[PDB]
């Protein structure tokens, strides 16, 4: 396990969700139509909590890793704005200790691995990342000290992933929705290319269903898994101890909501209305239309 | 079948509405026994009717103002066609215009008696 001897926690910052966190509600194709649906959604223009992982170099070199335990409630919108693959996965459960079954989700850099077990998680859970100089390759370790009484496991098809630390603006936006309903843990996702110094982008985007897991466990809390590099973010430096590349993530809770969804000819969701937002949005849902006439 | 006559009753009602739509159109537009042509010389005293008369260059004898007006507006369910086509309604409407501009009100009471348009 990793043992960080120093950590500075910042208070929860906030940013606006705009029109984000919409996902395809069901496995049904629909085309050139407006459709009204009730589900857990991220409310439009709600405040999403903001968290960061950063290393600041200097004579008082400051290392920051926001990975608190957070409430899950009925479900979570999660987004990350990143330069490098620093966010690696999540833990979900109730006690987050060996007394109860917890879901582990982890991108190891070859496969997504999913497990449900009575985990003895590390006192601070992180992915320990290091460069093996003889094999000329990255390696990953260190989420838990033991696992017992496992009730589910899955492993994705293989892929390759870059773990080198990149400078400049945030280049990647990753968006996820997590839900725990009827005994099914449902995941939705999307990836978007961006070029931003900070915050979520304005504009509309719909997350596709990624997977649907029949795990049955009671989830009330979760935690993000961050990569910690044992060494440099790029070759040829001379620093010491752990580091993390610059990453930001955003957390928004889902609520029971009515939405009106616009589907184009190609059956992509191109726009939406949160019917509970304001009296104009309720008027758009009342008329089942994105345009309201004089009246 | 335990409910007896209710479907035959509902279909009789909808059939009666459908027959009335043809009657309604017939009582409005079929008000002339003759399809009046407007003369090839449009010498109506300086009054110009080209936007309300047919243009024969169109695939139907709608007027220009009728072309504007026409641009503005599986579960056991069907739409039946009207008896008269929009082309036939335009032919009745064309006859009513030609009657009025060539003969004033006279075609309304008897034969169309020509009168000059300024004289009318």
């Amino acid at each position: 396990c990793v043992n960080l001897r120093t950590r500075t926690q910042l208070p929860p910052a906030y940013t606006n969700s705009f029109t984000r966190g919409v996902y395809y509600p069901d496995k049904v194709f629909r085309s050139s139509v407006l459709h009204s649906t009730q589900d857990l959604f991220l409310p439009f223009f709600s405040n999403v909590t903001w968290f960061h992982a950063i290393h600041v170099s200097g004579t008082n070199g400051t290392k920051r890793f926001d990975n608190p335990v957070l409430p899950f409630n009925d479900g979570v919108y999660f987004a990350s704005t990143e330069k490098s693959n620093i966010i690696r996965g999540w833990i979900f459960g109730t006690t987050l200790d060996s007394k109860t079954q917890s879901l582990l989700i982890v991108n190891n850099a070859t496969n997504v691995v999913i497990k449900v077990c009575e985990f003895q998680f590390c006192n601070d859970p992180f992915l320990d990342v290091y460069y093996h100089k003889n094999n000329k390759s990255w390696m990953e370790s260190g989420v838990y000290s033991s696992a017992n009484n496992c009730t589910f496991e899955y492993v994705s098809q293989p892929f390759l992933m870059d773990l080198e630390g990149k400078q400049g603006n945030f280049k990647n936006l990753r968006e996820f929705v997590f839900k725990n309903i009827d005994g099914y843990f449902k995941i939705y996702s999307k990836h978007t290319p961006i070029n931003l110094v900070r915050d979520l982008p304005q504009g509309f985007s719909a997350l596709e269903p990624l997977v649907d897991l029949p795990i049955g466990i009671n989830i009330t809390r979760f935690q993000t898994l961050l990569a910690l590099h044992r060494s440099y973010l790029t070759p040829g430096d001379s620093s010491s101890g752990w580091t993390a590349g610059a990453a930001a993530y955003y957390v928004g809770y889902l609520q029971p909501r009515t939405f009106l969804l616009k589907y184009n000819e190609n059956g992509t969701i191109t726009d939406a209305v949160d019917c509970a937002l304001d009296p104009l949005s309720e008027t758009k849902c009342t008329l089942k239309s994105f345009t309201v006439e004089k009246g | 079948l335990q409910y007896g006559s209710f479907c035959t009753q509902l279909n009789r009602a909808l059939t009666g509405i459908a027959v009335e739509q043809d009657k309604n159109t017939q009582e409005v537009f079929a008000q002339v026994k003759q399809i009046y042509k407007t003369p090839p010389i449009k010498d109506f005293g300086g009054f110009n009717f080209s936007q309300i008369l047919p243009d024969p260059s169109k695939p139907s004898k709608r007027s220009f103002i009728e072309d504007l007006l026409f641009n503005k507006v599986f579960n056991g369910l069907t739409v039946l066609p009207p008896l008269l086509t929009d082309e036939m309604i335009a032919q009745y409407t064309s006859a009513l215009l030609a009657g009025t501009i060539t003969s004033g009100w006279t075609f309304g009471a008897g034969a169309a008696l020509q009168i000059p348009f300024a004289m009318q």
Partner: protein
């Protein structure tokens, strides 16, 4: 007139996905799930609600057709009195002296 005929037919169509207290709105679910005696009690609930929907549609259509007949009678009277004549009836054929 176009909007009301569409809105009424759309309401008639979307009443087919109402349960009316049956186990499903889909008549083939009942008949693929249930036997001779179990099915018919569910079929009678759909029959009753679908029949109620259809009686409601035909009654709105009769009332709506009487408005169109009144309108067409007025149109036919303006065809006689305004197009086939010169009316002296004030404001029957536009404003001003016809």
């Amino acid at each position: 007139v176009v909007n009301q005929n569409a809105q009424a037919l759309n309401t008639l169509v979307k009443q087919l996905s109402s349960n009316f207290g049956a186990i499903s709105s889909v008549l083939n679910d009942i008949l693929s799930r249930l036997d001779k005696v179990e099915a018919e009690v569910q079929i009678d609930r759909l029959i009753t609600g679908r029949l109620q929907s259809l009686q409601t549609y035909v009654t709105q259509q009769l009332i709506r057709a009487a408005e169109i007949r009144a309108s067409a009678n007025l149109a036919a009277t303006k065809m006689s009195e305004c197009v086939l004549g010169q009316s002296k009836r004030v404001d029957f054929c536009g404003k001003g002296y016809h």
